[PDB]
Design brief:
The chain is mainly α. It has one domain: Lysozyme (Orthogonal Bundle), CATH 1.10.530.10. It is built from four helices and three strands; from the N terminus they run ααβββαα. It has a three-stranded antiparallel beta sheet. A hairpin with a 5-residue loop joins strand 1 and strand 2. Helix 1 crosses helix 2.
């Protein structure tokens, strides 16, 4: 599923991501835009052999199990394919753990390079 911008904002808010760990809703929408372009099915392989899954590009070395990643820890206790669902619940629950791990939203490289320090409120402008 490719979410609309305000559609994803409403879903992230209903799931408790707005202001979670101090990160306003626009930070999360901006992160999803640049990690997956709002596409729940997005997958991308990394040079270390891991793969990133879903709307928030959650990694198979630390967070989810994909069965093909050396040194996998599966800290979210979830198959990586579950993070590709049209229902974002599993991605939100895992992202809440990632953002609590010590580095905040710096865990998302696209957030650090394309959202951090910008006017993130623009990503929720116009939404009701």
């Amino acid at each position: 599923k490719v979410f609309g911008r305000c559609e994803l904002a409403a879903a992230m808010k209903r799931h408790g991501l707005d202001n979670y760990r101090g990160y306003s809703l626009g930070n999360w929408v901006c992160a999803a835009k640049f990690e997956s372009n709002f596409n729940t099915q997005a997958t991308n392989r990394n040079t270390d052999g891991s793969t990133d899954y879903g709307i928030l590009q959650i990694n198979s070395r630390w967070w989810c199990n994909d069965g093909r990643t050396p040194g996998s820890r599966n800290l979210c206790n979830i198959p990586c394919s579950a993070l590709l669902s049209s229902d974002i619940t599993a991605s939100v629950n895992c992202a809440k753990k990632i953002v609590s791990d010590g580095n905040g939203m710096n865990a998302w490289v696209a957030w650090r390079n394309r959202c951090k320090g910008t006017d993130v409120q623009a990503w929720i402008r116009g939404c009701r």
